[PDB]
Structures are given as structure tokens and as C-alpha cells.
Write a protein that binds this ligand. Sequence first.
Ligand SMILES: CN(CCO)c1ncnc2oc(-c3ccccc3)c(-c3ccccc3)c12
Length: 257
Amino acid sequence: EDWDLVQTLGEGAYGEVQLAVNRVTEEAVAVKIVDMKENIKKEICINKMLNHENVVKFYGHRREGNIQYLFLEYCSGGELFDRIEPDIGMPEPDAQRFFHQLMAGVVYLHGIGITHRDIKPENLLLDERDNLKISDFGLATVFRYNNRERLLNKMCGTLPYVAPELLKRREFHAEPVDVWSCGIVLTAMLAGELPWDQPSDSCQEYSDWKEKKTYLNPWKKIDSAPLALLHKILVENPSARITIPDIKKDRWYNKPL
Ligand SMILES: CN(CCO)c1ncnc2oc(-c3ccccc3)c(-c3ccccc3)c12
């Protein structure tokens, strides 16, 4: 149980992720390396609640002086982001499959009162069977406790995926915001492109979308069935926006491919 550090698998703010393999049992893991010179105690506290096949497995922590260590399931398939060919995307049947799994993961987190708050292709990893795994709970927080919803007010995430209500509202519900980001993801997957830099009335592309101008990119690359689902998800008003139970009833979602 001396995981030795075979190779860097990436970098970041915090620090890096190493491919730590055992040498006796040879069991691979991803290890997160975080120079504390928070946040870390919340991400662990959260990683400790999680158990699901579309959520990235948490194994342990190790304080070790100045550097925190997170032993997390290894995803040798890499990021969904690299399965998205620019300007093209991917085959509709692969996208549907990744959406299915993504929704199973999100349902699961929401079910236990947790919101991820930064859903994007970069944070969706793929194992060697290409199974989608939600990764990175550093922006993640509790929106439900003792069966009692708390609204959010900390603005965070990544702007091209963030829902309009969180740029414009003092406080807002957690669940629609993940719902929106999942639809920006789906768009990326079917088009190879992000529609806007941000969902704000000062962004031409976003104003073009609200005006149902879907003869522009990205939308013209998207077949009508998935596009009608995107019409229900990317609803500006978070109360009018589609919920996950209803996403699961939608025609494209249930289309055999
Ligand atoms: C990024 N985290 C930690 C979050 O769980 C990972 N976790 C668990 N397994 C993983 O496999 C990877 C990975 C897989 C293939 C190539 C490169 C990396 C990565 C990876 C991804 C990007 C950057 C850094 C690392 C990864």
C-alpha cells in the first residue's frame, strides 16, 4: 500500500493529479495533490457521501504535512472534452448515451441534496468502457438538508455553461442551474461548439437564441429531435425550465439509436 507515482495525468490550480499505481497489487488510482499554501475539507466531506456508477469514486485522504491527497477512481478514457471534435461534435448515438449517464449521475447527486455547480466536458471523465463519471466536487455544495431546500447566492462555475439566473439574481435554486449546464454540454456534443460566452442580454448569440433564430450555428447542425429538447432546457426562466423527470420523458431522450 505504497502507491508510487507512475506519471502525471494533469495539472491545475490546487496542484496536479498523478497516476499512482500500486506495485504489489498493481491497482491504478488517480491522486489529487493540493498545496494548502477549506474547500478541501468540503470537497472531501462531499466526496465521502458519494456512491454511484456515474460519479467518480472517492477512496481516501492523506493530510501529509502541507499537501492534501485525494485517492479517486482512475478514468483511463480521459475527458469527454477530447471526444468532442471541434465544429463537428460526435455521432448522435454516442451523445445520447453520454447524456443518459450524465442524467443518471445528476439525478443521483440532487437526490442526496448535492449540486455539482460546474458541469462541463472537462469534468466528465470516461473509464475504459467509456462510461461517463462526474468528477471534481470543489465547487459542489449542499442545497438540500433535513428535506429543506436552501437557495444559493455564491455565483460560480464556468461562464459558457452557467445559467442566466445566476448572473441576474440575488438568490436562485440549485437544480435548474445543473439542468442548464447539462444542456450546454449536450449542445457541445452535437455541434462541436459552445453557443455563447455567457447567457446575458448583452451577448448577441444568446439574444439570437431567445429570438428562436435556429438557422444559425450551433443549432442548424443539430437534428430537430434533440433540438426540441434543447428548447425545453435552455429556457431563460428557471421556473419554466424543464426538470430531469421530464427530460426522461422527452422524445429524443427515448429515441432508439
Ligand atoms: C482529473 N482527475 C481527478 C478528478 O477525479 C482524474 N481523476 C480520475 N481519473 C483520471 O484520469 C485522468 C486522465 C485520463 C487520461 C489521460 C489524462 C488524464 C484524469 C485527468 C484528466 C485530465 C487532467 C488531469 C487528470 C483523472
